[PDB]
């Protein structure tokens, strides 16, 4: 893809903010200055975080860009990135990107960061099996099915999301750094085969059960399971409850909003030592 003649920067890059970025990058003196495709070929790096950018329309004509640092902007549509075949590092933290469908020819992309975009659907990752690093913290991700296809990742961050099923990760045995803290994980069984782990984080899990009826002798089953499949005994129980394996029981003579319990168990997988820690809360009606 190539511009048909020397064209003013203003007319290639429709976003005022991104046009200025290119102008400064090319060391031109005005957004009306015409640029040749040769000058657009010479750009290999765009560092433009917190620059008020709403659109990267025009970037299609930058074949050779290898790095894109675009954190803290306002990008919603990444379609113009589709055909940047030489891009290796892409940072889009704190943007509004909610769709990765259009990343289906970034076959040299090794590092992707999409933290804090409010993303839930990550299925477009199926097009990037060569990824070595993927940062997805602070998003609204429930379904990590597609990550099973990302078998070359060594670093994967999924912290502070809405995940409870981590079975999709069982075949990612090249993983060395896995961040899973602040999710809804109560079952560690499927992480048992990740024997190359050096760093694992598993703290502050929160599990909010579906409501049950209040009653004097309240019984709630424990379903917190270790990697070996055995139940994790609660550490602390609210409202003077106690543990009658496999259930947690309370005497509640008066009505209460909610009951809960904390679990905390040290864990080892391969060379990585972690703390499987969290809270299960049971609303009453």
The residues with which 231 forms a beta bridge, in sequence order, are 225
CA–CA separation, 96 and 28 (whole Å)? 30
* Residue 46 · residue 68 · CB < 8 Å: yes
CA–CA separation, 220 and 142 (whole Å)? 24
Strands 67-69 and 236-237: unpaired
Left, alpha or beta for 141 (phi > 0: left; psi -120 to 50: alpha)? beta
Q: How was this structure obtained?
A: X-ray
The residue among 154, 198, 145, 199 whose CA lies nearest residue 172 is 154
**Nominal resolution in Å?**
2.6
Interior angle at CA 83, CA 118 and CA 175, nearest 5 = 55
Is residue 246 reached through a cis peptide bond, with omega within 30 degrees of 0 on the bond before it? yes
Strands 34-35 and 89-91: unpaired
Instruction: Give me the domains of the chain, ranges plus CATH numbers.
Output: 1-210 (3.80.10.10), 211-285 (2.60.40.1220)
Strands 199-201 and 67-69: unpaired
CA–CA separation, 221 and 214 (whole Å)? 15
52 vs 11, 17, 28, 55, 75, CA distance in Å? 19, 6, 20, 10, 9
């Amino acid at each position: 893809e190539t511009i048909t003649v020397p064209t003013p920067i203003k007319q290639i890059f429709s976003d005022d903010a991104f046009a200025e970025t290119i102008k400064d990058n090319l060391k031109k003196k005005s957004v009306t200055d015409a640029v040749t495709q040769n000058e657009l070929n010479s750009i290999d790096q765009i560092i433009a975080n917190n620059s008020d950018i709403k659109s990267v329309q025009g970037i299609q004509y930058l074949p050779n860009v290898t790095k894109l640092f675009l954190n803290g902007n306002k990008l919603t549509d990444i379609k113009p990135l589709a055909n940047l075949k030489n891009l290796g590092w892409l940072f889009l933290d704190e943007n509004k990107v909610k769709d990765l469908s259009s990343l289906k020819d970034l076959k040299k992309l090794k590092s992707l960061s999409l933290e804090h975009n409010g993303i839930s659907d990550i299925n477009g990752l199926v097009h990037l099996p060569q990824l070595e690093s993927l940062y997805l913290g602070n998003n609204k991700i429930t379904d990590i099915t597609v990550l099973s296809r990302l078998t070359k990742l060594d670093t994967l961050s999924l912290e502070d999301n809405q995940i409870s099923d981590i079975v999709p990760l069982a075949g990612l045995t090249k993983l060395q750094n896995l961040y899973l803290s602040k999710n809804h994980i109560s079952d560690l069984r499927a992480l048992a085969g990740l024997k190359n782990l050096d760093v694992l984080e598993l703290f502050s899990q929160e599990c909010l059960n579906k409501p049950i009826n209040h009653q004097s002798n309240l019984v709630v089953p424990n379903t917190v399971k270790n990697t070996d499949g055995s139940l994790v005994t609660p550490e602390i129980i609210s409202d003077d409850g106690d543990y009658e394996k496999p259930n947690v029981k309370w005497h509640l003579p008066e009505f209460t909003n909610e009951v809960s319990f904390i679990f905390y168990q040290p864990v080892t997988i391969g060379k990585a030592k972690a703390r499987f820690h969290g809270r299960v809360t049971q609303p009453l009606k």
